[PDB]
Amino acid sequence: AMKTLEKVNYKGFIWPLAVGIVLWLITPWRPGGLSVQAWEMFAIFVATIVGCITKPLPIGGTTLLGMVVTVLVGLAPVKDVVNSKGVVIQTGILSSFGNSAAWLIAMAFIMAHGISKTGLGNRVAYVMIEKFGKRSIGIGYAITGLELMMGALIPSNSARTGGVTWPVVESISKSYDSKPNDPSRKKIGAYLDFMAFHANILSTALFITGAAPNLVAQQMAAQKGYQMSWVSWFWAALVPVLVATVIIPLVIYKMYPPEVKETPNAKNWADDKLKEMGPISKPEKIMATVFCLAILLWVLSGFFKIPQLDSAFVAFLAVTLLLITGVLSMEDALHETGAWNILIWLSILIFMAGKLISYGFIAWFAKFIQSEVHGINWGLVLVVLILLMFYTHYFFASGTAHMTALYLPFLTVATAMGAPLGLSAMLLAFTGVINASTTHYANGPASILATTGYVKQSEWWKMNFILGLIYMVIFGIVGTIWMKIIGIW
Amino acid sequence: AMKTLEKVNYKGFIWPLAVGIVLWLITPWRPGGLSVQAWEMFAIFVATIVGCITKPLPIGGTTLLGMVVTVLVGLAPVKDVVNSKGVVIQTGILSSFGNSAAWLIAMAFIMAHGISKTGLGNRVAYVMIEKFGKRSIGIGYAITGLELMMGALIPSNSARTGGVTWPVVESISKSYDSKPNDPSRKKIGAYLDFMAFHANILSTALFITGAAPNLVAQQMAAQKGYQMSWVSWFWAALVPVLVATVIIPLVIYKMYPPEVKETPNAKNWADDKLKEMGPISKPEKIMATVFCLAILLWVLSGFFKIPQLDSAFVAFLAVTLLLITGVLSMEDALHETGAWNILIWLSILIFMAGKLISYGFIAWFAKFIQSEVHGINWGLVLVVLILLMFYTHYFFASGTAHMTALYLPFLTVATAMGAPLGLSAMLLAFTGVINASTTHYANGPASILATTGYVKQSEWWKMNFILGLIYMVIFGIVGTIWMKIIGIW
């Protein structure tokens, strides 16, 4: 019954494969000490990322093409190759899909559809349109304050983004007639999408329990003899985080203003639509009960490290509660396509970047940086190390892997050339937080919010580059002078 | 705006939950030598399967609830617990989803949607409705011939079902107005679904390359000192397979007839609808070409063991070709809910059965049966071993794992009690083939065809039980005397 082919953007293929081909041919001229497979994997990964920007096919199609090409040129098995002694000496593409980040985000997508089905989403949206809808930046500051308060309680940033702030932004933009993948997207949806992302960055920076890279940094710094202690982290971050809480939202507002900037009659419009919506119903009350069990289990996860409190498992059990309760048919959860899309593409990207790690590319880079800096005072060693830890996150889809790979090497560099370990440790952990202001695979929240269709990826990458400059300036300078005002060095 | 709740079948919970609770509560009197964790995992598994038949929720919902319950009672982590030397000492629930069987079947589901989207399916359906179909048992024997022909070439049984025979059955039954999850299913669809399953069983029985358990059996028999020789297997199976090729289709036709048994004008109807479909189009030409590249890559799978020829990867590569050409939009591939349903539920069931293995349940069973059979002549030893090898496949979601677990133990039993090594090696390998006539998770094809909505699972299990009796009689006795005519025992 199909007559013509789907319109495919073939020009989108010109840039990635050309880039890949060119870097393929530069394999004889690799830096030395590397590996031919390491350089080939770098080539395929960069080609795939450029494909995620030039968009031949949606990102799922581009990452599927990348994964298929990866297997085709012999850089990754399909099944895990097992040691002899049980170890997996090289992992295949099918294990890509047993990833915690992807599964947490996908199940969070399913519960967000639950929220919007009940009608709870629009109830929360109208409550917040009444209390801050007068002036859009009021709503923006509302959700940044909400994220900042959640930072100290919900120890995983992806749970905060996919469970709370993204449902809020979606609801609010639906009540404003702002739908994704549409010109309509720019009435308020895109500004609040980007603001949610950077609020998540700020909340991760404020608390040592904002994201797992923070705790990796804490363990690695403790290995070298420096104890971060929540209050230590909090007091070191308080003033730079506040300077950022004022600078970043306003630079976003000037750079990415939200079309509709004032709703002078927001209070009465919101009250009317809450009155017509009627009192809360039993599907919405059930949904709220499951939502607060998800929040409470995520918070207890912070104190009890057990499987039953795993952030992905909390989402799984929340959705199975949603199924047994009757809020959600399983045909409702099945054709909620964002979950399976993110499962495909984010798992493939995490796998390819992990291969970048496992072939010795990041290790070679750490060794290169260890050998290249020698005749310099420790202040400039610190500036250069902050810059390198920042910009190497273009080659990471995790954050925990980034810290595991480069935090202890860079920290040993800094202390080996005279810099004080507490200051350097704090600076590098902060850079590990502000790394998120880069790619769409930087962390979980970046993967959610760069893909919802409200913010194009041109704008995402460019504005994140600008904000990364501002974040580094803020944290570097303000945090260094604040951290000796408090006595850390 | 949701008004009232989705209807949930709560009575469906009584039987599984009752069974689970009682099997939990009799844990102290477990058979002895069995871990409490093995017995508890057994209880959860039986509860989940009983739920898949009593249906408190769709199969995805019940297996998800089962997996959540598994984690809740401390029988499975969420992340893999790794040794401190790379070994995995306990496997978590997220690794379940990097499964080749589930992913192969899911990508085949999306490629079948491609076939039926282009209109290629209905062209194939009308060609065979014109060449067979005036009498529906003609269609049944046609698809049985198709499976029999593919058995010697395409080494994966699920690839044969999901890549070829299921699209054929769906196409034909859509052209016969026999449509799933409704009474209309009984015009011809259910008959062709069940007949496809058993054609796949027979073709797997005919050739030593019919499914992976065959090659596991041959390697184990060589470990014990008996060499199967393709022609060996073919010659030993041919006459029993022919007796089955005559008996089983007729027993299915009498037991499960297809309401529409005669189409007196089938050839002219098919010629009419082929005339009006018009000449083949470029979308269908592209789809047919990628289909036959999939088939040739699957046949090369039989001779070259390389990742680029992996049957799951071949499915991935076929779908990415379908994406590059434009046959399939990526939103088309995203809202095909059968693929994600099969991924979820089949991955969870394979995971739970694996836990059945890894906790030592099947090992205790092998040792118990080793202790139980002692004072009996070897003919009765062979009968009871065939019976046990058949009926233990209710506690297996793989088949390869079943063979790896119990084939060499049962064979050492049989040979240790006087039986001739070639005879029971062949009898147990045949039993491993005809094991499929059991559950809906028996093998890949069983999970595909038992779930399409054409065959209820009540009738599936019951009719599979009857046909399993018939399969055992045929293969056991007829194959034993036929294998005595040849120089085997």
Numbering used by the authors:
A (entry chain A), B (entry chain B): 0 to 488
What text comes from the article?
The mammalian SLC13 proteins are members of the larger divalent-anion sodium symporter (DASS) family. DASS proteins typically have a molecular weight of 45–65 kDa and form obligate homodimers. Each protomer consists of a scaffold and a transport domain. Structural information, along with cross-linking and computer modeling, indicates that DASS proteins operate in an elevator-type transport mechanism (Reyes et al., 2009; Drew and Boudker, 2016; Garaeva and Slotboom, 2020).
We also solved a 2.85 Å X-ray structure of LaINDY in the presence of both malate and αKG, using the LaINDY-αKG cryo-EM structure as the search model for molecular replacement. The structures of LaINDY determined in malate, αKG and in the malate/αKG mixture are in an outward-facing, substrate-bound (Co-S) state. The architecture of the LaINDY binding site is similar to that of VcINDY. Notably, within the binding site, density corresponding to substrate is seen in the X-ray omit map of LaINDY-malate-αKG, and in the LaINDY-αKG cryo-EM difference map, in a similar mode to substrate binding in VcINDY. All three Co-S structures are not only similar to each other but, importantly, also to the LaINDY Co apo structure, with pairwise r.m.s.d.s of 0.41–0.52 Å, indicating that substrate binding introduces little conformational change. In contrast to the similarity at the substrate binding site, major differences between LaINDY and VcINDY are seen at the cation binding sites. At the Na1 site of VcINDY, an arginine (Arg159) is found in LaINDY, stabilized by a salt bridge with Glu146. Similarly, a histidine (His392) in LaINDY is located at the equivalent of the VcINDY Na2 site, with another histidine (His401) located 4 Å on its extracellular side. Based on these well enclosed and sterically occupied cation binding sites, it is unlikely that sodium ions bind to LaINDY as Na1 and Na2 do in VcINDY. Rather, we hypothesize these two positively-charged residues in exchangers act as permanent surrogates of the Na+ ions in cotransporters.
